[PDB]
Amino acid sequence: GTLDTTWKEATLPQVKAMLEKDTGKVSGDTVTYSGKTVHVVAAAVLPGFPFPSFEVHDKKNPTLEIPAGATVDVTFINTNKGFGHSFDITKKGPPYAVMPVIDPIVAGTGFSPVPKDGKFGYTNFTWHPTAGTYYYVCQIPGHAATGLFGKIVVK
């Protein structure tokens, strides 16, 4: 397939507005989405959160519960200075090797731009999942191995 390798730029307040567009409901460490079309907004290492992690709806690496047959619009933002993290959805689960074995990637991005001059790289892609469990992971060597992944349950 093709990975999403095209990115836009957002200042911090734009990043924050976008994060607030996530349509999920938080419960504990889970984010549950409902409806025909859902909007997942994920960020790589929001300030104040542990490295390395993804934040979705203000939670760290949460399990995303998505309805089978939904159109999933994912916005991925990299807010972590010094890194070009990716966001890739795969059926291969953890733990991951330093070079993570995650092919085939069912939907996702290439490496993001590193933050520069108050601007953060972000991108939008769409996913049409069938029922199953998937994981969202970064491909930068060692990141997935050190905790940069989360789970998705589609049902």
147 near Cu ion (CB under 5 A): no
Which region among 4-12, 19-27, 80-88, 89-97 touches Cu ion (by CB under 5 A)? Answer: 80-88
State the nearest-atom distance from the C-beta of 139 to Cu ion, in Å.
7
With 0-12 CB in 10 A as exposed, 13-18 as middle and 19+ as buried, what is 75?
A: buried
Identify the sign of the CA torsion 148, 123, 12, 55: negative
CB–CB of 89/128 below 8 Å?
Answer: no
Cα 124 to Cα 74, 98, 104: the distances in Å are 6, 27, 19
138 near Cu ion (CB under 5 A): yes
Choice from 56, 107, 137, 140 touching Cu ion (CB under 5 A) = 140
The residue with tokens 């957002």 is 10
The residue with tokens 């060692």 is 142
Which region among 6-14, 92-100, 106-114, 135-143 touches Cu ion (by CB under 5 A)? Answer: 135-143
The residues facing 124 across adjacent strands are 75
59 near Cu ion (CB under 5 A): no
143 near Cu ion (CB under 5 A): yes
Residue nearest to Cu ion (CB): 138
77 near Cu ion (CB under 5 A): no
Q: Which one, 80 or 154, has the nearer CB to Cu ion?
A: 80
Q: Which residues bind Cu ion (CB under 5 A)?
A: 85, 138, 140, 143
